[PDB]
Amino acid sequence: NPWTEYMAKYDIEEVHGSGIRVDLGEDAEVGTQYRLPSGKCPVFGKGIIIETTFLKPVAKDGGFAFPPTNPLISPMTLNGMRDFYKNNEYVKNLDELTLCSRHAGNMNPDNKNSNYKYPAVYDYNDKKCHILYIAAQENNGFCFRPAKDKLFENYTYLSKNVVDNWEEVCPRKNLENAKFGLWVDGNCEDIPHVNEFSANDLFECNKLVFELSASDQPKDRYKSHGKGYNWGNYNRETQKCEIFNVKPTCLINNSSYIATTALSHPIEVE
């Protein structure tokens, strides 16, 4: 299988290792244990819909983000962060997503050393890192839910564990003229069983895959560890989002198709 190295980033269980729709793959104490995001990959286009937009600072007149601080460490621009850490050579040159993740992970709420590290959102639109004070992602029993949405397409959801080489080992772009397959005896075969959801465009397919992807809460017991319906083959001609839950191990050339994952950006292709 010559696809092995290339397909590694699509082994979402291995490279991400946590929930995607809802990421709560670890626990940390602050006396009391709390659930918190721990996925190793950035989630492109993921945001939180409040049923106040969620990047507003916490106060129900407030959102999910860090309250104002002195100095203001959230929200903080990329340049603001690089300046803040200008003396730290291990941090100052990190890519924007990892830096945002490390910046959020810098703020210890236990003022003893604790393992609790806030998740974050980097907004590519105005180059701002938003530390999330609230790590919750769904409450549909304040009612809210995670989603991919046009309003969120420049948002990126970042756990404390985002790896510094995510660009190399994590999905971002959708693959044009390509279909996920399974390598069997020297040939790339079709995913034998897929779940067909109609979708008007690639965005809607990406949205659907996200909705069905690995999730660490319903709607240790609940942890997905990255297992789930994380991949989709979008047939742009029949407008079918072909969703499946086993890792792909090769690509098939097919101009009718675009290959997407729950982690991938909902628009960008390569």
Binding site: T69, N88, V91, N108, N111
Partner: peptide, 13 residues
């Protein structure tokens, strides 16, 4: 109030 984990340690409120 939070405390930075990376040196230099500081208190940000």
């Amino acid at each position: 109030c939070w405390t930075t984990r990376m040196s230099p340690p500081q208190q940000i409120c």
